Amino acid sequence: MYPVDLHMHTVASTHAYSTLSDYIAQAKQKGIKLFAITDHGPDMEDAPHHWHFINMRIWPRVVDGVGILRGIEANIKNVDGEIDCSGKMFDSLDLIIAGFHEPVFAPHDKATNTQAMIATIASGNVHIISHPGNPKYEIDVKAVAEAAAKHQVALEINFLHNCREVAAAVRDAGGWVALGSDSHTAFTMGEFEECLKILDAVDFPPERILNVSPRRLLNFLESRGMAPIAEFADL
Amino acid sequence: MYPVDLHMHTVASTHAYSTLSDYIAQAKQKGIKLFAITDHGPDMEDAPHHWHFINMRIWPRVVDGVGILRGIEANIKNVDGEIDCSGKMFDSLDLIIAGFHEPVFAPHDKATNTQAMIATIASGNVHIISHPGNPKYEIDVKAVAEAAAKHQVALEINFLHNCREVAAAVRDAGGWVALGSDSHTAFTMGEFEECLKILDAVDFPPERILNVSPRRLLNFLESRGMAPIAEFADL
Amino acid sequence: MYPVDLHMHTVASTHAYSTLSDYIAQAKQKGIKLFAITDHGPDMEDAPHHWHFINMRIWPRVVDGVGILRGIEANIKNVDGEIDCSGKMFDSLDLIIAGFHEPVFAPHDKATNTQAMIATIASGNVHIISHPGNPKYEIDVKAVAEAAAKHQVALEINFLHSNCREVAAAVRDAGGWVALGSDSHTAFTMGEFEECLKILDAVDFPPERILNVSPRRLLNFLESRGMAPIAEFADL
């Protein structure tokens, strides 16, 4: 179940401990068929240089049968919904996640957090919002889910950095959910058991979970304007 | 012999070249049953962010049968025996090694060094003093061995950064020795054949070498205040 | 063919993604018998600390039958041909590559770039000039190739960082060496020099002046430049 994991971090931050090759190896063993590396965007503390993201265009697409997406976990910078990902960085990347992390955007009033998150969602630049359920950052969950559904952004169901409320808001707003391990070692790759239970409780519809198959996720990215990746044709 | 290595460094410093996964693979190959990663403390040049240590809490305890300890090689900060390890770092770690490294504590007058080391030993915060037999830092030795025995701190017998003196001296003072490779690649993991023969030179008592077994070392840590690690119970 | 690759980068830069062990494993799989790690010199952005280079002296020489050279891709710093490699770094390293990279030396007038590159060559401190064919740094290719032959420096035949026929033909006539280098930033492209090869043959480049044909040829070149012989490689 869910042979896709979309959110993890490499030694590019010292607070992560696994490399691209560790992740490929763990994917192969666990039967994960498609994954994305999404290192923290460069404005954060302990994050890689922006070249880290631009040079991901060099990576192989398929290794040991495992498909590899080039991603970022960009940081929401302001209430205008700007993130620390440049045009050149976008050009090299397949997957844009964005979230709140305190060095870049300190938690503020509910209206502030909400406006920034919705402005990021409305920018058309991001595919997934990471850990929107984080109690550190209070938000209007319903207003966020409705914007995410309108602009076709997935909300993550997801340490160093509200399961039911988000899952139920997405359920009713009609949006996508993305499962992500936020792995900082390859050992938790693809492990998102903690929420699966809640999703079943709130009767979240299986059809709106991106992680169900490589093709469902790739189709979603293509619906968002991504050119088809020919190497993933047999996934 | 000595299936425990307690002092090694990962790519969290650019002057080291191996990852957690490299150390695991090597441990498996060399029959090492328990090991600790002890990356340089954050005040040192070319050392990781403090989050590198806090986030070690996420690591698996046992991989491929090998136990994994979360450590630091802290740098002695000042004559008050302070080290560059915060309380939040402590909370995340099992093993606290500390030692003199030039960028942080420029070697000074004997008395400065000693006030400093014997005071680190006396802080109760430290488990092992790394390469105390290093000529770049002169210290009252017989005396350091006597404080180490008094305070239950092991002295390492041990590039970029006297064996007999320490070995004979710890022998007579009644304290513990800890063997540590100070590996900066996984290739030298578990290799301390150099000082060892100087140990059989002073007829060092077999029962005061921590590395003889995982349980011996783990009981030592527990005696120093560490809660028992449930996953190592069968080690 | 070309069981030697001399130019590649590890996670010591975040714009690279592979470790020493990843390169070892790939060399074995690809039949590479000798390779060098040549991380970006410390003056560049996103480059390691200088200790990254000094401490390479601890590396094993041969792992699983593959020989490992300790290198640097140093940055040309100025028109005096200085590079960001210290005496203590030189003492730890086997192989010295140097090249232009934006943050350290900005592309300037053809004569500036030329003077800087030739002075580096003429320093005697360098074995190989990396991607001299880079269109971002206009040079007098003939004057460079002639300096390189005089001072026994190899020119590389060669995204982020990022004339191939013009370099090879200049080296051909000047009578110098060429070195092949993948400039890998993951181990997946290790030993991969397909692109320029057809053009080397197109210009009748003499194969006897390609360093990479065998480990011994490359090692003999380094010894010729003053490197004490590496005992552990005696059988390569």
Ligand SMILES: [Zn+2]
């Ligand atoms: Zn993180």
Ligand SMILES: [Zn+2]
């Ligand atoms: Zn995050």
Ligand SMILES: [Zn+2]
């Ligand atoms: Zn994350």
Ligand SMILES: [Zn+2]
């Ligand atoms: Zn070190």
Ligand SMILES: [Zn+2]
């Ligand atoms: Zn040390």
Ligand SMILES: [Zn+2]
């Ligand atoms: Zn150390």
Ligand SMILES: [Zn+2]
């Ligand atoms: Zn590079």
Ligand SMILES: [Zn+2]
């Ligand atoms: Zn270069």
Ligand SMILES: [Zn+2]
């Ligand atoms: Zn390079």
